[PDB]
Amino acid sequence: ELDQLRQEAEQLKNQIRDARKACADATLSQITNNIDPVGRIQMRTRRTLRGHLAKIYAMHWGTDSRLLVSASQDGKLIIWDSYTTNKVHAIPLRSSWVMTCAYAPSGNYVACGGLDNICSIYNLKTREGNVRVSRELAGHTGYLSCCRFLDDNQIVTSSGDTTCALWDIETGQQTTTFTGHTGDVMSLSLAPDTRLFVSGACDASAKLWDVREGMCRQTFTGHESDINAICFFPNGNAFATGSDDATCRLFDLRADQELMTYSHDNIICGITSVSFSKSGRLLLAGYDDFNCNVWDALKADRAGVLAGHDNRVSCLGVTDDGMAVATGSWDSFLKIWN
Amino acid sequence: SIAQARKLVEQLKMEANIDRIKVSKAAADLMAYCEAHAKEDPLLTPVPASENPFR
Amino acid sequence: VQPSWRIALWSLAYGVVVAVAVLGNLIVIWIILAHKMRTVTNYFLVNLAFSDASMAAFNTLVNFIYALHSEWYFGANYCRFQNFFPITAVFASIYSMTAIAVDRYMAIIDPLKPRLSATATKIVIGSIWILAFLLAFPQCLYSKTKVMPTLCFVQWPEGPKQHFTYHIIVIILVYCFPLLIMGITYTIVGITLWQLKAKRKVVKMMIIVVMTFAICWLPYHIYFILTAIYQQLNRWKYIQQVYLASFWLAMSSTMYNPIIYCCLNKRFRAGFKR
Amino acid sequence: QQFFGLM
Amino acid sequence: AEDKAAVERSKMIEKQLQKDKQVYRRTLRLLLLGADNSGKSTIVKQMTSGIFETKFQVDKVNFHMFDVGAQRDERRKWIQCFNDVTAIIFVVDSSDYNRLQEALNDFDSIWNNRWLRTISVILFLNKQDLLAEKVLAGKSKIEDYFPEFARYTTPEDATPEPGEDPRVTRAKYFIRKEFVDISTASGDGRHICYPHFTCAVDTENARRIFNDCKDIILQMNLREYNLV
Amino acid sequence: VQLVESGGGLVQPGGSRKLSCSASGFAFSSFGMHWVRQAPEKGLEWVAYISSGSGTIYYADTVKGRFTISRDDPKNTLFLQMTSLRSEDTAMYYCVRSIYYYGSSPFDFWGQGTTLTVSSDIVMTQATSSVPVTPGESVSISCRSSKSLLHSNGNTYLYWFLQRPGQSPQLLIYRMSNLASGVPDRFSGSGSGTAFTLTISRLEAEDVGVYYCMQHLEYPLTFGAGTKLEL
């Protein structure tokens, strides 16, 4: 008798698709063809942060736009002073397979996680002068792919167990669990208002969650392969996903559907990291073709290229003030661009 | 599986009640946000070396 | 002066040697330092390539043009330079050969022990070059350029008993000792390495290198030892031909490194087509 | 005649 | 807070990083792969938590063995983390012929994985003492699952082991033939498989890994030095 | 966090003594360590400094070549050797915990102080020397420097301290605008490059003490005379 509700779900998905199509009056290209092109964007490597041993899987900027934490698969977090390339802290990790790192918006804590299935929280502002593990968030049955601080006591982690979990750092338990994805949730992006976040999973779907009620608001299924990167548009009304389809896609939360596709026939390799500029006009996208690609977020044009890395570009972060873009890679170097 | 597939149907009707707006309106809103903050984008419009803290 | 008959063949052989050597060596340097392989392992290699290029370009050509007619067409100040930089290039190329041999030895018999510190390589390169300079200094400071009616870039430190001992030192620690180290290293590596066609072609390379070094640098050193001890041989009317043969044999070692790298490594064999 | 060689 | 005292701190951190690079370079990282029926865990003891790490030393060489556990069935994403690893220790249950076919498919995906194209596989055909009994008795054979076993005969390599039934040799060298076939027909010369025969208790396994990792690093050095 | 100094007592001028500070409760190896003396009924005076890892070592001009600030990280003990003591060296020798990175707060913890009794520089001037006042009303304390403390970085290397009677100085404001840890938000530092003002919003019974200022722009570090606050 489950076939009846299976057909119900099929007709429901058809209803969603038809509603999305009926709301599709004009593409983003048709509306922004009449605006000035961004033009040739040329960033150059202002800083090169050296010191990581193995490949770099993740970076996160501090909210001060000067400090950045970097995660290396040698089992080390390094806090960098990007202005002076000074290593502020070198945090040795219990597990050598960290796949994500986060900076608390207050700057007091840094989170990391990876194949150990644990979101380790490190307190940078100890009175003893050493960075020590404030908490270890166990409870995920898969590898941790992303973590993002909401406050100094809340953090949402995405895991390879097809589940996103909201955590309480003081308690150490999952306040909420998001269980909609059918594949490894690879990326995670917090909305600027922090009330929502989006997830990208290997099931090619992107889901929008409410961090409070634990409800998946919307589901987006534009891609064809695993979504490796996700980032919110600066106003929180849209997000961009980068997949193994060698394609970046822009989705609108209110339109509930895809806006643009950022693909080039010359590129056939998956996107590892994705980010926006401060105004959201530039869509930076890391690739395993060893180089990042600057995109025109409104016209889907390749505005520029960041080609300073000698291995797969794994992480990518634009400062909160929008001054620079840092780009870590599997060659163990971060690069600050401007 | 019927209970598990019930949740799949539950979310699908739940996700079909969202109040959608025209893609024209959303595109216009994104363009307006990009235009408003284009002046404050050090990436879109590079600032001279005086204000750039990396050089 | 030399007759037009023999100088034709001498010029052809020397020109082919210099040309092949310099072309291959700068091609190797371009491949290493441009295709950033450009790793620490290819630093002794690029140092050896630069030393071989310097050898072929300066030492071989200048001493061939000087020995073709036994006339110094160069300035008196240049004579003091020819006994400093070409000679230090000779010694640096030989010491780069032996350092590369030792490096490959540690790479093969002890693979788990990692490559040098990426700065000890620079330390060894600098030590090689300063040792070559220290070795060539007696040839530079004590180099005369007396003219007569047709200049001759002679060298005369003291009586022949001191020139002989200098060339004995030079042979001992530039042919006998590098050959000993290279032979021991490469025979151990060949025993260890003796898919399987590559690990045997490497051994063939290494035995070729050891035998060619021992065969080429021996007459070159013996000629200078004999000439230093016996100045009566300088007026043999045939010592010029003996010197040309020995110098050609010694300086032909420059072309062998690029040929070895091309015939061995597929990456080099492909990058030489570009 | 004379001939040194200039190693 | 002087900047000169922060650069001194950053230089002191670099000094800690450089002496941690010495240990990281001198250590060898290994990835254990295999199914539940394969004696992967028994090898570990004889030499939520999403990764298990075993450190063993052979002849003053540090080996870091990374048994992956408490993950999902799909591994196309976290296997990228193990690129630039010294070797992959693949352990196979050679006795269970029904699950043996899935071991080749598991081995096939690892070998042709885009991120493990430069990583050699040290194959450990485990529980070969159980494999001898399963073919000496003859109750269950290989032809019931592999039709090409009847047309297979022992090659020139004829089991220089002290004493074993020729059918044991024919069967156990047929399992190698299936596994070596994948590593050769479906791969380049960038990485080499290293088949081995392993029992439930075999103290020689740490030496086999050391010898085979010595050869894997040897071919890395033969390529680092362009001697090939 | 705890710093305890040992050594002191009556010393003849033609003698010598060695001061030691045992550190406990923090990563002593990762902290630069300062010696700051305080003559009886006088202001603080910076004596010596040793960086983390026993690298950069500095001395005061009045003490350079005579004292030796040694450090033994494994025992978490800081030393200070004195070769030929003078009558001017009579002071309570504080030992200060200081760490330097972006956003750091050096001079944040001071030792309880050991007493030793013996039988150019950026001059910091606190014009006011005593500000008697009642609790409840805001209090402002001002100081001036010989040259601008506003570095090209964008931060003003000015540090405010408070030595309550019968206690050790404690950090209030670091880099002229940053509240220290555990300090109430009543205190507030201001200034542009040469004139600095510390504004206590609602002075309480614990604010009675001497409020020193110190520059960290260049060595030697120089303290002001300190403005006492009577009650």
Of A67, A125, A128, the CB nearest to F102: A67
- Around Cβ C215, how many Cβ atoms within 10 Å? 11
Q: What values do phi and psi take at A11, rounded to 5? A: -70, -30
Q: Please report, for chain B, the start and end positions of each structural domain, with discontinuous segments joined by +.
A: 2-54
Tokens coding A263: 């693909």
**CB contact F31 to A (< 8 Å):** yes
Q: Which positions in chain E touch C108 (Cβ < 8 Å)? A: 218, 221-222
Grouping H, G, I as helix, E, B as strand and the rest as coil, residue A311 is: coil
Contact E83, A57 (CB under 8 A): no
Q: Which positions in chain A touch F99 (Cβ < 8 Å)? A: 129
Measured CA to CA, the distance from residue F98 to residue A290 in angstroms comes to 42
Q: What values do phi and psi take at F33, rounded to 5? A: -130, 130
Quote the DSSP letter at residue A275: E
Measured CA to CA, the distance from residue C67 to residue F118 in angstroms comes to 85
Measured CA to CA, the distance from residue C266 to residue C197 in angstroms comes to 14
CB within 8 Å: E8 and F157: no
Nearest to A277 by CA among E146, B30, C210, E59: B30
Element (H, E) at A238: strand A238-243
Measured CA to CA, the distance from residue A221 to residue A14 in angstroms comes to 13
Quote the DSSP letter at residue A243: E
Sign of the C-alpha dihedral, residues B17, B23, B27, B29?
negative
Instruction: Note the helical H segments in chain C.
Output: 4-34, 44-54, 61-68, 76-82, 85-109, 120-141, 160-171, 177-193, 196-229, 239-251, 253-264, 266-271
Nearest to E214 by CA among E87, E32, E129, E90: E87
Q: Which positions in chain F touch E12 (Cβ < 8 Å)? A: 52-53, 55
Of E3, E64, E72, the CB nearest to A142: E72
CB within 8 Å: E74 and A183: yes
Grouping H, G, I as helix, E, B as strand and the rest as coil, residue B35 is: helix
Quote the DSSP letter at residue C55: I
DSSP string, chain F: -EEEEE--EEE-TTS-EEEEEEEESS-GGGSEEEEEEE-TTS-EEEEEEE-TTS--EEE-TTTTTTEE--EETTTTEEEEEESS--GGG-EEEEEEEE--STT--TT-EE---EEEEE-----EE-S--B----TTS-EEEEEEESS--B-TTS-B-EEEEEE-TTS-EEEEEETTTEE-TT--TT--EEESSSEEEEEESS--GGG-EEE-EEE-SSSSP-B---EEE--
Neighbors of chain B with 3 or more C-beta pairs under 8 Å: A
Measured CA to CA, the distance from residue F3 to residue F92 in angstroms comes to 14
Q: What is the CATH number of the domain that holds C145?
A: 1.20.1070.10
Measured CA to CA, the distance from residue C250 to residue C171 in angstroms comes to 13
Per the rule left: phi > 0, alpha: psi between -120 and 50, beta: everything else, F117 is beta
Grouping H, G, I as helix, E, B as strand and the rest as coil, residue E150 is: coil
Tokens coding E8: 């001194």
| F229 assigned to some structural domain | no
Contact F169, F162 (CB under 8 A): yes
CB within 8 Å: A67 and F103: yes
Contact A302, A293 (CB under 8 A): yes
Q: Which positions in chain E touch F106 (Cβ < 8 Å)? A: 1
CA distance A165 to chain E (A): 15
**CB contact C168 to E (< 8 Å):** no
- Around Cβ C113, how many Cβ atoms within 10 Å? 12
Tokens coding B37: 């903050």
CB within 8 Å: F31 and A129: yes
Measured CA to CA, the distance from residue A116 to residue A143 in angstroms comes to 6
- For residues C37-46, one letter each, b for 16 or more C-beta atoms within 10 angstroms of the residue's C-beta and e for the rest, the string is beebbbbbbb
* Number of domains composing chain C: 1
Dihedral in degrees, nearest 10, Cα atoms E99, E106, E217, E79: -130
Look up tokens 């956003």; give the residue: F103
* Distant-in-sequence, close-in-space partners of C170: CB < 8 Å, separation ≥ 6: C135, C221, C224
Measured CA to CA, the distance from residue F117 to residue F139 in angstroms comes to 35
DSSP string, E34-99: --SSSTHHHHHHT----EEEEEEESSS-EEEEEEE-S--S--TTGGGGGTT-SEEEEEEESS-HHH
For residue C153, count CB atoms less than 10 angstroms from its CB and return exposed for 0-12, middle for 13-18, buried for 19 or more. Answer: buried
* Distant-in-sequence, close-in-space partners of A247: CB < 8 Å, separation ≥ 6: A223, A261, A262, A263, A271
CB within 8 Å: A128 and F103: no
- Around Cβ F27, how many Cβ atoms within 10 Å? 17
CB within 8 Å: A127 and F103: no
CB < 8 Å & 24+ apart, contacts of F165-171: F165/F208, F165/F209, F167/F209, F168/F94, F168/F110, F168/F111, F168/F112, F168/F113, F169/F36, F169/F44, F169/F94, F169/F110, F169/F212, F170/F110, F171/F105, F171/F107, F171/F108, F171/F109, F171/F110
Contact A242, A272 (CB under 8 A): yes
**CB contact C2 to D (< 8 Å):** no
Paired with E68 in beta bridges are E51
Nearest CA in chain E to A186: E77
Of E6, E48, E78, the CB nearest to A141: E48
Domain span at residue F57 reads 2-118
CB within 8 Å: E226 and C45: yes
The edge-to-edge listing of strands for the beta sheet with A132-137 is A98-103, A109-114, A119-123, A132-137
Helix axes E205-224, C85-109, angle to 10 degrees: 160
**How far apart, in Å, are the Cα atoms of F143 and each of A27, C28, F140, F150?**
64, 67, 10, 14
Which of residues F64, F84, F118 is at a domain's end? Answer: F118
Q: Which positions in chain F touch E1 (Cβ < 8 Å)? A: 100-101, 104-106, 155, 157, 174-175, 216
Chain breaks in chain F (C to N over 2.5 A) after: 119
Measured CA to CA, the distance from residue F162 to residue F171 in angstroms comes to 7
Q: What values do phi and psi take at C247, rounded to 5? A: -65, -40
Nearest to A20 by CA among A271, A180, A333, A257: A257
Look up tokens 């290593």; give the residue: A87
Measured CA to CA, the distance from residue F132 to residue E130 in angstroms comes to 93
Measured CA to CA, the distance from residue A104 to residue A124 in angstroms comes to 10
CB within 8 Å: F100 and E12: no
Strand-pair category, A132-137 with A144-149: unpaired
CB within 8 Å: B54 and A237: no
Nearest CA in chain E to F57: E5
Nearest to A200 by CA among A148, A154, A235: A148
* Distant-in-sequence, close-in-space partners of B7: CB < 8 Å, separation ≥ 6: none
Are residues F90 and F128 both part of a single domain?
no
To test the contact with chain F by mutation, choose from A106, A124, A130 the residue with the greatest count of F C-beta atoms within 10 A, namely A130
CB within 8 Å: E9 and F174: no
At B18, the amino acid letter reads: I
Are residues F103 and F128 both part of a single domain?
no
Distance of CA F77 to the CA centre of its chain: 19
**CB contact B3 to A (< 8 Å):** no
Are residues F160 and F63 both part of a single domain?
no
The edge-to-edge listing of strands for the beta sheet with A282-287 is A271-276, A282-287, A292-296, A304-306
Grouping H, G, I as helix, E, B as strand and the rest as coil, residue E11 is: helix
Instruction: Note the helical H segments in C41-159.
Output: 44-54, 61-68, 76-82, 85-109, 120-141
Which of residues F72, F90, F118 is at a domain's end? Answer: F118
**How far apart, in Å, are the Cα atoms of E105 and each of A284, B38, C263?**
38, 53, 39
Distance of CA E134 to the CA centre of its chain: 24
Are residues F11 and F73 both part of a single domain?
yes
Quote the DSSP letter at residue A190: E
Distance of CA A177 to the CA centre of its chain: 19
Chains E and C touch (3+ CB pairs under 8 A): yes
Domain span at residue C229 reads 4-271
Q: Which positions in chain E touch A141 (Cβ < 8 Å)? A: 48, 70, 72
Quote the DSSP letter at residue C15: H
Task: Please report, in angstroms and rounded to a whole number, the separation of the first and last CA atoms in chain A.
Answer: 60
Measured CA to CA, the distance from residue C7 to residue C30 in angstroms comes to 33
Contact A132, A122 (CB under 8 A): yes
CB within 8 Å: A28 and B23: yes
Strand-pair category, E62-68 with E28-33: parallel
Are residues F134 and F90 both part of a single domain?
no
Angle value at C-alpha F2, between F165 and F167, nearest 5 degrees: 5
Distance of CA F206 to the CA centre of its chain: 19
Tokens coding A77: 């977090």
| F59 assigned to some structural domain | yes
Contact A309, A327 (CB under 8 A): yes
CB within 8 Å: A81 and E24: no
Task: Please report, in angstroms and rounded to a whole number, the separation of the first and last CA atoms in chain E.
Answer: 55
**CB contact C197 to E (< 8 Å):** no
- Which CATH number is associated with domain A35-337? 2.130.10.10
How was this model experimentally determined?
cryo-EM
CA atoms within 13 A on the CB side of A177: 10
Paired with A209 in beta bridges are A197, A216
Strand-pair category, F124-125 with F139-145: antiparallel
Are residues F129 and F113 both part of a single domain?
no
* Distant-in-sequence, close-in-space partners of A199: CB < 8 Å, separation ≥ 6: A158, A164, A178, A181, A185, A187, A188, A206, A207, A209, A230
Contact E6, F102 (CB under 8 A): yes
Which of residues F118, F137, F171 is at a domain's end? Answer: F118
Contact A226, A249 (CB under 8 A): no
CB within 8 Å: D3 and C224: no
DSSP string, A112-170: EEETT--EEEEETT-TTSS-EEEEEE---SS-EEEEEESSSSEEEEEETTTEEEEEETT
DSSP string, E102-149: HHHHHHHHHHT-TTSSS-EEEEEEE-HHHHHHHHHS-SS-STTT-GGG
**CB contact F123 to A (< 8 Å):** no
Quote the DSSP letter at residue A213: T
Measured CA to CA, the distance from residue C212 to residue C182 in angstroms comes to 12
Grouping H, G, I as helix, E, B as strand and the rest as coil, residue C255 is: helix
- Around Cβ A259, how many Cβ atoms within 10 Å? 24
CA distance A93 to chain E (A): 13
Of E3, E5, E10, the CB nearest to F51: E5
Number of inter-chain CB pairs under 8 A, E vs F: 39
Contact B24, A24 (CB under 8 A): no
Q: What values do phi and psi take at B31, rounded to 5? A: -65, -40
Tokens coding F221: 């570090």
Element (H, E) at E10: helix E3-26
Tokens coding A222: 């534009």
Nearest CA in chain D to C69: D3
Contact F223, F44 (CB under 8 A): yes
Measured CA to CA, the distance from residue E200 to residue E130 in angstroms comes to 9
- Around Cβ F129, how many Cβ atoms within 10 Å? 11
Sign of the C-alpha dihedral, residues F174, F179, F182, F187?
positive
Domains delineated in chain E: 3-224 (3.40.50.300)
Superfamily for domain range B2-54:
Transducin (heterotrimeric G protein), gamma chain (4.10.260.10)
Contact E35, E93 (CB under 8 A): yes
Contact E89, E32 (CB under 8 A): yes
Mark which residues 261-300 of A lie under 8 Å from E by CB. none
**How far apart, in Å, are the Cα atoms of E223 and each of A191, C267, E24, F77?**
48, 10, 21, 51
Contact F116, F100 (CB under 8 A): no
CB within 8 Å: B16 and A323: no
Sign of the C-alpha dihedral, residues C67, C70, C73, C77?
positive
**How far apart, in Å, are the Cα atoms of A90 and each of A58, A78, A328, C210, E172?**
15, 4, 16, 49, 50
Contact F47, F60 (CB under 8 A): yes
Chains F and D touch (3+ CB pairs under 8 A): no
Contact A254, A20 (CB under 8 A): no
**CB contact E5 to F (< 8 Å):** yes
At E167, the amino acid letter reads: R
CA distance C112 to chain E (A): 6
Of D1, D2, D5, the CB nearest to C224: D5
* Distant-in-sequence, close-in-space partners of A17: CB < 8 Å, separation ≥ 6: none
Paired with F44 in beta bridges are F38
Element (H, E) at A269: none
Grouping H, G, I as helix, E, B as strand and the rest as coil, residue C75 is: coil
To test the contact with chain A by mutation, choose from F101, F155, F179 the residue with the greatest count of A C-beta atoms within 10 A, namely F101
Q: Which positions in chain A touch E14 (Cβ < 8 Å)? A: 51, 87
Angle value at C-alpha E93, between E92 and E96, nearest 5 degrees: 140
CB within 8 Å: A67 and F25: no
Measured CA to CA, the distance from residue A171 to residue B4 in angstroms comes to 30
Of E214, E220, E226, the CB nearest to C265: E226
Q: Which positions in chain F touch E3 (Cβ < 8 Å)? A: 153
Tokens coding F42: 């006088």
Tokens coding A48: 């090169």
Nearest to E212 by CA among E126, E123, E141, E136: E123
Of F27, F30, F102, the CB nearest to A86: F102
DSSP string, A62-119: -TTSSEEEEEETTTEEEEEETTTTEEEEEEE-S-S-EEEEEE-TTSSEEEEEETT--E
Nearest to A47 by CA among A318, A326, A314: A326
Cis check for the bond before F13: say yes or no (omega within 30 of 0).
no
At F78, the amino acid letter reads: L
For residue A8, count CB atoms less than 10 angstroms from its CB and return exposed for 0-12, middle for 13-18, buried for 19 or more. Answer: middle
Measured CA to CA, the distance from residue A336 to residue C89 in angstroms comes to 42
* Distant-in-sequence, close-in-space partners of B10: CB < 8 Å, separation ≥ 6: none
**How far apart, in Å, are the Cα atoms of F37 and each of F1, F34, F63?**
20, 10, 11
DSSP string, F64-100: TTTEE--EETTTTEEEEEESS--GGG-EEEEEEEE--
